[PDB]
RNA sequence: GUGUAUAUGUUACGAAGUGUUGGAUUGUUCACCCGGUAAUGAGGAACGUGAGAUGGGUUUAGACCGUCGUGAGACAGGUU
RNA sequence: GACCCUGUUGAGCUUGACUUUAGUAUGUUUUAAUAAAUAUUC
RNA sequence: GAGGCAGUAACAAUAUAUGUAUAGAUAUAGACUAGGGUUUUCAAUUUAUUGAAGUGAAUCGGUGUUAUAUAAAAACAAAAAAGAUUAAUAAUUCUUUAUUAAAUUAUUAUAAGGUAACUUGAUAAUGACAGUAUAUUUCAAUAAAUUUAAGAUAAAUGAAUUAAAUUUUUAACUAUGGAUUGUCAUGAUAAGAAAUAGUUAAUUAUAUAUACUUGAUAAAAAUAAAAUAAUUUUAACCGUACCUAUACCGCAUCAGGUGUCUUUGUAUCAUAACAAAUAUUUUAAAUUAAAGUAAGUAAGGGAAUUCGGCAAAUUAGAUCUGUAACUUUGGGAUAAAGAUUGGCUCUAGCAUGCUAGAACUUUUACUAUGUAAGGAAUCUGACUGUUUAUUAAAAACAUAGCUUUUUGUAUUUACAAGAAGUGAAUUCUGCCCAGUGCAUUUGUUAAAGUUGUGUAAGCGAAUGUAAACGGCGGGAGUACUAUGACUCUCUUAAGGUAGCCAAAUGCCUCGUCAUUUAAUUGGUGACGCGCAUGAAUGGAGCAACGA
RNA sequence: AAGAUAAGCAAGUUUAUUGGAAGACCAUAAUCAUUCUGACGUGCAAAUCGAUGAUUUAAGAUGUGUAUAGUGGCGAAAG
């Protein structure tokens, strides 16, 4: 609450530039977020390794992207298989 | 002079070369069914591997995009095409994404190994039984059919989004990948160690474009360039 | 002596007894201002004096800019 | 004597100094037999 | 082999009339490994010389397994502790109570019980694996009480000081149940909460449970069975003394260097300092030199000394008010600037040892030890980091960021693997392919072979390429004086655009104007025909940071 | 700094707590070598001593084992 527009990138302090800290705020928001489990339906999916997403309740691992749970190039190739 | 850095790095690779996995899938005559067991992580590479189980035998494979533990996949020359299945090349329609292509039949796999990089199919030619693929590098290569491949985009996403904002982040990258880091520019060196070295100011004094005609120890700089500079 | 009425000067002869002292800028010697007094005179002694001192410049090996040389490199051109 | 000069005395380094060489590119000759097609000379 | 200088420089030098004692003085101390090898202990003769004696293992090390074709006395692995003895060894000798393995004896269950989790002789398990933060207070230690003992005071003291021992519910799972409930924090549940009944355990601080950082996800191999009692000239080979700095290495009894662990009391954040414990140690003079190496104090003036405030001095802990220009909106900031602080006797809160307020009193209170001088500007490097062991710590190197190039037959597979230049962010990156290089494509030129004849790459020519090496002129007239928007003209590959300056880059030069001072070759702000400024051989720019 | 809870005002927005991220700030033991151009300079010493300084959870410090040899090796680059 204490920060006006920096957000999660306030740990870096007053270094590395201005636009380098903008690029950190996009990625670090989607990494630390928790998501819904596709199997059990609960919101407990977290990331622990690059490319591995696992749930706390049902304990089932999912493959995925580096920093997001789903990839924008990953979802377009699901639509063309549905037709 | 002395032996420079480039030749001294290659002979350091003969004393202790780098080690990786090279994962390949088996060959089976008819369509079988297998189950995904677990997902792991290796030292050098970024893309996670997967352990599948065909006929009570556990192999290793590159994980596709949507894959969870306990799912069932099929392997064969005539399997149905969906996410994670492995079929022949002639069955897939034009426009999809495949990520392990063997050059010849009954081989493990050659093309599309890393994470985030995929290829596309552009056509089929019923005369001479050939299909043209679109490589990730951007070049159209003509492939013979009857090779088998896996359907889908590989995992691990776009790693190149966030930068190494610190120097310490790039230290652990090059150390795991067995490369030399940090690197010193060749202008700072004395003229024993490198051809560009020495002088009163830091400058080159020689043209940096070097032909490929010359012998192996003379190759440095931009080797055999067709063009140099910003286009626009 | 005088183009010496007094005051204030200027020139010449004898004379080395005693004085000739404070600061801003520059590595300075030289230079030029402020303040003062009876008057900030010119010089020598291995261009007095480093087993008396200090080490600012000049003058080994690090490094930067400018000019010359295709290059290693150079400069009584400027810096640390 | 490290500065300076002489010696038909040396060494590290560069290059459009003189003389050459590892590597590499391209010819010719050596290359399993068989049948057929095509071209060039007579 | 032996002189002068020369008995000169340079080093060592505690008190007692009677003593195996009473005092003074300096230094923390003790164990495993690497190195040393008899220095250990005793006797005799004067840190010496000779002579004897001394090292005891089924459970303490090695001998065993391996680190992806010779590797571990700190990784892995069958098993013990007290209490005494010798001039010197003691988890090894002796007494007492235990444990492991192998060979021979005596005896025998082949399954019961619970709805369930599970209980009893009734096999097939593992060695085996990052870092940080918080919450538990297990032990242990303090504190209190009690019981035996000790040492001192001219006196006095509700009974002081020292030693030994005795004491001070939670997590999973099962059965009913049908919708709520927890932690210092994040929560958990129709894939069954609270509440009941029950079955397992509670890992001893190098532990348990959670959370957090990562393009780093955190070794190998040898290795397994079980009930009760008994026996043994059954358990091989090697090392077990002593020293941790006057018993190692530096030619030495050298102010240097050398892996790990343990160590008592006061100490209201700690630190610093002092005291315990333990080990060493014997005898010249003195109110008096000069000049040295250290430590102190100073009337009046306050940088006038000097290349330069070099050396020294001032500030400082904690509580309460208060806080600017600038900015990359995070910072600047502990900015700057003020006020308070002892001792004793009480009052008031609840969390019970911490915090506010009040009265009395004095040659007034963090200051024994420890503990930031502050502000305003300019040049250069973005930052944390590294470097010439022994004259250079920096503006040099590195770094993320930006850009160019080669490879689709990689034990590895283009978000990959090799080769180069600039150097965070913001804003920009102008013109030239004539020269030298680089790439692509259709006149001259060797040998060998065939009766004889013919055929190579390369060089040359054409087309692209400057974030490849590099380069980016001069003269004449023309609107009271003055200047030249405008015009003419030699050539060339193109004739320095956006910007910036007597700057770390300007010879003449101590350039011209303003300002800073009593006075300036210094500093800052403006001017430009720039000896010889200028765009990734990067130009312009300062917020944060700087021995 | 994220994350979380309450009390106000009325899609939101002020105030107070809890929490403990960062190549953030400061000290002891340990480490290094800026200044006095201090001491010593046939020295304690073939590079030492004193005061003053810089440094802190990491691109750190250190024991042992295996690999790299002289026209050769290693190098955050000073020959
Ligand atoms: Mg250099
Ligand atoms: Mg060379
Ligand atoms: Mg440069
Ligand atoms: Mg003279
Ligand atoms: Mg003289
Ligand atoms: Mg002298
Ligand atoms: Mg003299
Ligand atoms: Mg000097
Ligand atoms: Mg040049
Ligand atoms: Mg010079
Ligand atoms: Mg001659
Ligand atoms: Mg020679
Ligand atoms: Mg003496
Ligand atoms: Mg003896
Ligand atoms: Mg003993
Ligand atoms: Mg004993
Ligand atoms: Mg012993
Ligand atoms: Mg012993
Ligand atoms: Mg030792
Ligand atoms: Mg010693
Ligand atoms: Mg005296
Ligand atoms: Mg005084
Ligand atoms: Mg006074
Ligand atoms: Mg002065
Ligand atoms: Mg003076
Ligand atoms: Mg000082
Ligand atoms: Mg008071
Ligand atoms: Mg720096
Ligand atoms: Mg040095
Ligand atoms: Mg430094
Ligand atoms: Mg130094
Ligand atoms: Mg640099
Ligand atoms: Mg930049
Ligand atoms: Mg050209
Ligand atoms: Mg062009
Ligand atoms: Mg111009
Ligand atoms: Mg400038
Ligand atoms: Mg002036
Ligand atoms: Mg820090
Ligand atoms: Mg000195
Ligand atoms: Mg050898
Ligand atoms: Mg040099
Ligand atoms: Zn789930």
Short mmCIF file of C-alpha atoms (C1' of nucleotides) in Angstrom, two decimals, chain E residues 167-539:
data_model
loop_
_atom_site.label_atom_id
_atom_site.label_comp_id
_atom_site.label_asym_id
_atom_site.label_seq_id
_atom_site.Cartn_x
_atom_site.Cartn_y
_atom_site.Cartn_z
"C1'" U E 167 14.38 -30.32 45.12
"C1'" U E 168 11.76 -26.53 42.29
"C1'" U E 169 -1.17 -31.11 25.94
"C1'" U E 170 0.12 -31.66 20.24
"C1'" A E 171 0.26 -34.18 15.00
"C1'" A E 172 -1.59 -37.95 11.76
"C1'" C E 173 -5.17 -42.06 11.05
"C1'" U E 174 -10.14 -44.88 12.03
"C1'" A E 175 -15.66 -45.13 13.40
"C1'" U E 176 -20.20 -42.05 14.14
"C1'" G E 177 -21.56 -36.93 12.78
"C1'" G E 178 -23.71 -33.61 8.71
"C1'" A E 179 -21.44 -27.23 8.06
"C1'" U E 180 -18.26 -24.64 10.42
"C1'" U E 181 -13.31 -23.27 12.04
"C1'" G E 182 -7.26 -21.87 13.13
"C1'" U E 183 -1.95 -19.48 13.33
"C1'" C E 184 3.37 -14.90 15.61
"C1'" A E 185 2.40 -14.80 10.14
"C1'" U E 186 0.32 -17.41 4.81
"C1'" G E 187 -5.03 -20.45 5.92
"C1'" A E 188 -7.92 -25.56 6.07
"C1'" U E 189 -12.92 -27.95 4.37
"C1'" A E 190 -19.09 -31.79 0.18
"C1'" A E 191 -12.27 -35.65 -2.92
"C1'" G E 192 -16.23 -34.16 4.12
"C1'" A E 193 -15.36 -28.82 9.55
"C1'" A E 194 -16.50 -28.51 14.73
"C1'" A E 195 -17.85 -31.99 18.76
"C1'" U E 196 -17.49 -37.38 20.69
"C1'" A E 197 -14.97 -42.68 21.15
"C1'" G E 198 -10.23 -44.83 19.92
"C1'" U E 199 -5.12 -46.54 17.62
"C1'" U E 200 -0.27 -44.98 16.90
"C1'" A E 201 4.13 -41.42 17.82
"C1'" A E 202 6.27 -36.99 19.97
"C1'" U E 203 12.90 -37.32 15.80
"C1'" U E 204 16.47 -33.86 22.28
"C1'" A E 205 19.06 -27.39 19.02
"C1'" U E 206 23.96 -30.66 13.90
"C1'" A E 207 15.99 -31.18 16.14
"C1'" U E 208 10.39 -30.36 14.56
"C1'" A E 209 6.68 -27.71 11.65
"C1'" U E 210 5.71 -23.67 8.17
"C1'" A E 211 7.18 -19.65 4.93
"C1'" C E 212 10.80 -17.27 1.49
"C1'" U E 213 15.34 -16.69 -3.11
"C1'" U E 214 16.94 -19.36 -8.52
"C1'" G E 215 17.83 -19.31 -16.94
"C1'" A E 216 21.73 -22.48 -9.84
"C1'" U E 217 16.57 -27.45 -7.93
"C1'" A E 218 20.93 -29.17 -4.71
"C1'" A E 219 26.86 -37.07 -5.41
"C1'" A E 220 28.28 -42.45 -6.19
"C1'" A E 221 28.89 -47.69 -4.71
"C1'" A E 222 29.64 -52.16 -1.05
"C1'" U E 223 25.58 -53.34 2.14
"C1'" A E 224 19.47 -57.51 5.73
"C1'" A E 225 16.34 -61.05 7.90
"C1'" A E 226 13.65 -63.05 12.78
"C1'" A E 227 11.87 -66.93 19.31
"C1'" U E 228 14.48 -68.90 24.51
"C1'" A E 229 18.83 -70.72 27.14
"C1'" A E 230 24.24 -72.49 27.18
"C1'" U E 231 29.66 -73.20 25.71
"C1'" U E 232 35.03 -71.54 23.65
"C1'" U E 233 43.91 -72.45 24.47
"C1'" U E 234 37.16 -68.20 19.10
"C1'" A E 235 37.99 -62.93 16.81
"C1'" A E 236 44.55 -62.29 12.51
"C1'" C E 237 48.51 -57.73 10.68
"C1'" C E 238 50.56 -52.23 11.79
"C1'" G E 239 50.72 -47.57 14.90
"C1'" U E 240 49.76 -46.27 20.64
"C1'" A E 241 56.11 -42.40 24.81
"C1'" C E 242 56.46 -36.98 24.29
"C1'" C E 243 56.11 -31.09 22.11
"C1'" U E 244 51.65 -26.51 19.83
"C1'" A E 245 55.46 -23.10 19.91
"C1'" U E 246 62.60 -21.50 23.72
"C1'" A E 247 60.83 -29.64 21.08
"C1'" C E 248 57.42 -27.21 13.46
"C1'" C E 249 59.19 -23.64 8.48
"C1'" G E 250 62.17 -19.08 7.66
"C1'" C E 251 70.97 -21.05 8.02
"C1'" A E 252 69.19 -19.32 15.06
"C1'" U E 253 66.44 -20.06 21.81
"C1'" C E 254 64.13 -14.96 15.03
"C1'" A E 255 58.55 -9.11 17.41
"C1'" G E 256 57.14 -13.12 10.75
"C1'" G E 257 53.85 -17.62 9.16
"C1'" U E 258 50.73 -22.12 10.09
"C1'" G E 259 43.93 -26.69 9.53
"C1'" U E 260 39.83 -27.64 13.77
"C1'" C E 261 37.59 -27.34 18.74
"C1'" U E 262 36.79 -26.03 24.12
"C1'" U E 263 37.29 -22.20 28.06
"C1'" U E 264 34.80 -19.16 34.90
"C1'" G E 265 32.77 -13.91 37.38
"C1'" U E 266 30.86 -8.46 37.09
"C1'" A E 267 29.23 -6.24 32.85
"C1'" U E 268 20.26 -2.98 30.69
"C1'" C E 269 22.27 -3.36 23.07
"C1'" A E 270 27.05 -4.62 22.55
"C1'" U E 271 32.24 -3.38 22.39
"C1'" A E 272 36.31 -2.12 25.21
"C1'" A E 273 38.45 -3.10 30.15
"C1'" C E 274 39.43 -5.72 34.86
"C1'" A E 275 39.65 -10.12 37.86
"C1'" A E 276 39.94 -15.87 38.34
"C1'" A E 277 42.61 -20.44 36.58
"C1'" U E 278 47.59 -22.01 34.86
"C1'" A E 279 52.71 -21.27 33.56
"C1'" U E 280 57.65 -18.54 34.12
"C1'" U E 281 61.33 -15.30 36.86
"C1'" U E 282 66.70 -13.43 40.55
"C1'" U E 283 70.31 -8.38 42.15
"C1'" A E 284 75.46 -1.77 38.96
"C1'" A E 285 74.30 3.71 39.51
"C1'" A E 286 69.91 8.45 39.65
"C1'" U E 287 65.99 15.33 42.09
"C1'" U E 288 71.97 17.29 37.54
"C1'" A E 289 73.83 17.13 30.32
"C1'" A E 290 72.87 18.43 24.89
"C1'" A E 291 70.38 16.51 20.50
"C1'" G E 292 66.47 12.12 19.82
"C1'" U E 293 61.54 8.11 19.98
"C1'" A E 294 56.54 8.48 22.51
"C1'" A E 295 52.64 11.06 25.76
"C1'" G E 296 50.51 15.77 28.02
"C1'" U E 297 49.33 21.44 28.80
"C1'" A E 298 49.32 26.48 27.16
"C1'" A E 299 47.86 33.88 27.89
"C1'" G E 300 46.15 37.16 23.09
"C1'" G E 301 45.28 36.32 17.62
"C1'" G E 302 42.61 32.30 14.44
"C1'" A E 303 45.25 29.43 8.25
"C1'" A E 304 48.65 35.42 8.10
"C1'" U E 305 52.60 29.00 7.70
"C1'" U E 306 52.36 25.98 3.10
"C1'" C E 307 52.58 23.43 -3.72
"C1'" G E 308 48.04 21.96 -0.53
"C1'" G E 309 44.52 23.12 6.62
"C1'" C E 310 49.96 17.62 5.44
"C1'" A E 311 49.75 16.74 11.23
"C1'" A E 312 46.48 17.87 15.46
"C1'" A E 313 41.76 19.97 17.29
"C1'" U E 314 36.05 20.36 17.16
"C1'" U E 315 31.32 16.76 16.34
"C1'" A E 316 29.55 11.77 18.36
"C1'" G E 317 25.35 7.35 22.61
"C1'" A E 318 19.88 7.47 23.73
"C1'" U E 319 14.57 10.16 23.97
"C1'" C E 320 11.30 14.20 21.95
"C1'" U E 321 10.04 18.14 18.06
"C1'" G E 322 11.53 19.28 12.92
"C1'" U E 323 13.34 18.32 7.73
"C1'" A E 324 14.81 21.93 1.85
"C1'" A E 325 16.46 22.45 -3.65
"C1'" C E 326 16.51 18.14 -6.99
"C1'" U E 327 14.55 13.41 -8.80
"C1'" U E 328 15.37 7.49 -12.70
"C1'" U E 329 9.02 8.90 -7.99
"C1'" G E 330 12.15 4.24 -5.37
"C1'" G E 331 15.20 8.23 -2.94
"C1'" G E 332 17.76 12.70 -1.03
"C1'" A E 333 17.57 11.63 5.10
"C1'" U E 334 20.29 9.26 10.64
"C1'" A E 335 19.65 15.78 5.87
"C1'" A E 336 20.27 20.49 8.12
"C1'" A E 337 18.30 22.99 13.18
"C1'" G E 338 16.77 22.91 18.44
"C1'" A E 339 15.59 20.85 23.57
"C1'" U E 340 16.39 16.66 27.70
"C1'" U E 341 19.89 13.24 30.65
"C1'" G E 342 22.49 12.49 38.16
"C1'" G E 343 21.03 10.66 43.29
"C1'" C E 344 16.91 9.50 46.65
"C1'" U E 345 11.58 8.92 48.30
"C1'" C E 346 6.94 7.90 46.03
"C1'" U E 347 2.44 7.82 42.68
"C1'" A E 348 0.00 5.60 38.01
"C1'" G E 349 -0.74 1.57 34.04
"C1'" C E 350 -0.47 -4.30 32.97
"C1'" A E 351 2.46 -7.47 29.73
"C1'" U E 352 5.26 -8.11 36.02
"C1'" G E 353 9.73 -6.08 34.41
"C1'" C E 354 9.24 -2.34 31.07
"C1'" U E 355 7.24 2.85 30.34
"C1'" A E 356 5.18 7.82 31.58
"C1'" G E 357 4.60 11.87 35.71
"C1'" A E 358 5.51 14.22 40.67
"C1'" A E 359 8.23 15.98 45.35
"C1'" C E 360 13.40 16.69 48.00
"C1'" U E 361 18.71 17.65 47.28
"C1'" U E 362 24.08 19.19 45.03
"C1'" U E 363 31.21 23.26 43.53
"C1'" U E 364 24.85 19.85 38.15
"C1'" A E 365 24.94 14.57 35.37
"C1'" C E 366 26.36 9.43 27.76
"C1'" U E 367 31.54 10.81 28.09
"C1'" A E 368 36.90 6.06 32.80
"C1'" U E 369 36.52 2.87 28.13
"C1'" G E 370 33.99 3.23 23.20
"C1'" U E 371 31.52 6.93 19.74
"C1'" A E 372 29.66 10.99 12.25
"C1'" A E 373 33.09 18.07 11.50
"C1'" G E 374 29.08 20.48 8.39
"C1'" G E 375 27.41 23.18 3.83
"C1'" A E 376 27.65 25.13 -1.71
"C1'" A E 377 29.72 24.01 -6.69
"C1'" U E 378 32.98 21.71 -11.30
"C1'" C E 379 35.58 17.39 -14.27
"C1'" U E 380 35.31 12.12 -14.78
"C1'" G E 381 33.36 6.69 -13.85
"C1'" A E 382 26.52 4.35 -13.91
"C1'" C E 383 26.22 0.98 -9.25
"C1'" U E 384 28.04 -4.17 -5.71
"C1'" G E 385 33.01 -6.18 -7.62
"C1'" U E 386 38.76 -6.95 -9.35
"C1'" U E 387 44.17 -5.65 -10.32
"C1'" U E 388 50.85 -4.63 -10.93
"C1'" A E 389 53.06 -10.67 -3.94
"C1'" U E 390 58.10 -5.98 -2.67
"C1'" U E 391 57.77 2.27 -4.86
"C1'" A E 392 51.58 3.04 -9.11
"C1'" A E 393 44.25 1.02 -6.17
"C1'" A E 394 42.91 4.72 -10.40
"C1'" A E 395 39.49 8.05 -14.66
"C1'" A E 396 42.38 0.97 -15.94
"C1'" C E 397 39.62 -4.38 -16.24
"C1'" A E 398 34.80 -6.68 -15.65
"C1'" U E 399 29.42 -6.29 -15.63
"C1'" A E 400 24.17 -6.17 -17.06
"C1'" G E 401 22.11 -3.13 -21.61
"C1'" C E 402 22.69 -2.24 -27.28
"C1'" U E 403 24.52 -4.16 -32.14
"C1'" U E 404 27.00 -7.09 -36.20
"C1'" U E 405 28.39 -12.13 -38.08
"C1'" U E 406 28.92 -18.00 -39.11
"C1'" U E 407 26.37 -22.96 -38.77
"C1'" G E 408 19.94 -27.50 -40.47
"C1'" U E 409 24.64 -34.39 -41.34
"C1'" A E 410 26.15 -31.10 -33.34
"C1'" U E 411 27.48 -37.79 -27.71
"C1'" U E 412 24.54 -31.85 -26.93
"C1'" U E 413 20.52 -29.83 -32.18
"C1'" A E 414 18.92 -22.39 -33.86
"C1'" C E 415 14.79 -19.36 -26.98
"C1'" A E 416 21.17 -23.63 -29.40
"C1'" A E 417 26.61 -23.58 -30.37
"C1'" G E 418 31.30 -20.58 -32.02
"C1'" A E 419 33.55 -15.16 -33.42
"C1'" A E 420 33.87 -9.33 -32.59
"C1'" G E 421 32.76 -3.83 -31.00
"C1'" U E 422 30.61 -0.21 -27.48
"C1'" G E 423 29.45 0.10 -22.09
"C1'" A E 424 23.05 1.41 -16.73
"C1'" A E 425 18.44 4.52 -17.82
"C1'" U E 426 16.66 9.34 -21.06
"C1'" U E 427 17.46 11.73 -26.05
"C1'" C E 428 19.95 11.13 -30.74
"C1'" U E 429 23.00 8.17 -34.15
"C1'" G E 430 24.04 13.24 -40.37
"C1'" C E 431 27.04 12.81 -45.71
"C1'" C E 432 30.76 9.68 -48.72
"C1'" C E 433 32.04 2.88 -51.93
"C1'" A E 434 36.87 7.19 -55.34
"C1'" G E 435 41.41 4.02 -51.75
"C1'" U E 436 42.09 -0.73 -48.75
"C1'" G E 437 39.40 -5.00 -47.33
"C1'" C E 438 34.72 -8.68 -47.62
"C1'" A E 439 30.82 -11.20 -50.36
"C1'" U E 440 28.22 -12.88 -55.37
"C1'" U E 441 28.26 -14.19 -60.73
"C1'" U E 442 30.22 -15.03 -66.19
"C1'" G E 443 42.06 -11.03 -71.26
"C1'" U E 444 46.56 -14.08 -68.42
"C1'" U E 445 47.99 -18.86 -66.31
"C1'" A E 446 51.81 -25.22 -64.40
"C1'" A E 447 52.47 -30.39 -64.61
"C1'" A E 448 50.95 -35.29 -66.00
"C1'" G E 449 48.90 -38.12 -69.88
"C1'" U E 450 47.78 -39.23 -75.83
"C1'" U E 451 49.79 -41.43 -82.78
"C1'" G E 452 48.59 -36.18 -82.16
"C1'" U E 453 44.57 -32.25 -80.07
"C1'" G E 454 41.36 -30.28 -76.24
"C1'" U E 455 39.70 -29.09 -71.05
"C1'" A E 456 41.87 -26.25 -63.51
"C1'" A E 457 41.45 -23.07 -59.34
"C1'" G E 458 43.51 -18.21 -58.71
"C1'" C E 459 44.45 -12.96 -60.84
"C1'" G E 460 41.72 -9.31 -63.92
"C1'" A E 461 36.35 -7.11 -65.09
"C1'" A E 462 30.76 -6.19 -63.28
"C1'" U E 463 27.23 -5.55 -58.84
"C1'" G E 464 26.41 -4.85 -53.47
"C1'" U E 465 28.49 -3.31 -48.37
"C1'" A E 466 30.65 2.21 -43.80
"C1'" A E 467 27.25 0.18 -35.30
"C1'" A E 468 34.17 -2.94 -41.89
"C1'" C E 469 39.47 0.15 -41.80
"C1'" G E 470 38.58 5.03 -42.69
"C1'" G E 471 37.55 10.45 -44.63
"C1'" C E 472 34.24 14.85 -44.09
"C1'" G E 473 38.15 22.15 -49.25
"C1'" G E 474 39.42 27.28 -51.19
"C1'" G E 475 38.83 32.29 -53.58
"C1'" A E 476 36.07 36.94 -55.42
"C1'" G E 477 32.29 41.16 -55.85
"C1'" U E 478 27.05 42.70 -53.80
"C1'" A E 479 22.22 46.48 -49.56
"C1'" C E 480 27.15 57.07 -43.16
"C1'" U E 481 30.64 53.45 -42.04
"C1'" A E 482 30.55 48.19 -41.05
"C1'" U E 483 28.59 43.08 -42.41
"C1'" G E 484 26.87 39.86 -46.46
"C1'" A E 485 20.62 37.08 -46.49
"C1'" C E 486 21.90 36.91 -52.36
"C1'" U E 487 25.25 35.97 -56.67
"C1'" C E 488 29.88 34.29 -59.45
"C1'" U E 489 33.93 30.57 -59.63
"C1'" C E 490 38.80 25.97 -59.09
"C1'" U E 491 37.83 20.73 -58.11
"C1'" U E 492 35.70 15.80 -55.72
"C1'" A E 493 34.32 10.19 -53.42
"C1'" A E 494 32.06 13.81 -49.94
"C1'" G E 495 33.28 18.80 -48.83
"C1'" G E 496 31.92 18.12 -40.84
"C1'" U E 497 25.17 18.42 -40.44
"C1'" A E 498 22.37 17.84 -34.70
"C1'" G E 499 25.30 19.33 -30.76
"C1'" C E 500 29.76 21.32 -27.53
"C1'" C E 501 34.33 24.44 -25.78
"C1'" A E 502 40.45 28.44 -24.22
"C1'" A E 503 37.00 21.88 -21.35
"C1'" A E 504 41.95 15.93 -18.96
"C1'" U E 505 41.21 18.52 -26.26
"C1'" G E 506 43.46 26.51 -27.88
"C1'" C E 507 50.71 27.28 -30.03
"C1'" C E 508 49.70 33.02 -30.13
"C1'" U E 509 47.93 32.79 -24.45
"C1'" C E 510 48.79 35.12 -18.17
"C1'" G E 511 42.67 35.30 -25.14
"C1'" U E 512 37.66 39.40 -24.34
"C1'" C E 513 33.48 40.64 -20.75
"C1'" A E 514 31.09 39.72 -15.80
"C1'" U E 515 31.64 37.84 -10.76
"C1'" U E 516 34.22 35.77 -6.48
"C1'" U E 517 39.14 38.85 -2.99
"C1'" A E 518 42.15 44.81 0.20
"C1'" A E 519 44.98 42.67 -3.93
"C1'" U E 520 44.17 36.49 -8.50
"C1'" U E 521 48.54 33.26 -14.30
"C1'" G E 522 43.48 30.22 -9.73
"C1'" G E 523 37.53 29.03 -9.63
"C1'" U E 524 32.48 29.82 -11.94
"C1'" G E 525 29.07 32.05 -15.98
"C1'" A E 526 28.89 34.02 -21.18
"C1'" C E 527 31.77 34.87 -26.76
"C1'" G E 528 33.82 31.77 -31.07
"C1'" C E 529 37.30 31.81 -38.77
"C1'" G E 530 37.79 25.51 -33.38
"C1'" C E 531 47.08 25.44 -34.48
"C1'" A E 532 44.64 20.09 -34.06
"C1'" U E 533 36.26 19.37 -31.14
"C1'" G E 534 32.31 16.16 -33.08
"C1'" A E 535 28.32 11.34 -33.44
"C1'" A E 536 28.42 3.00 -31.06
"C1'" U E 537 36.93 4.59 -33.11
"C1'" G E 538 29.75 6.92 -29.97
"C1'" G E 539 27.75 12.70 -29.21
#
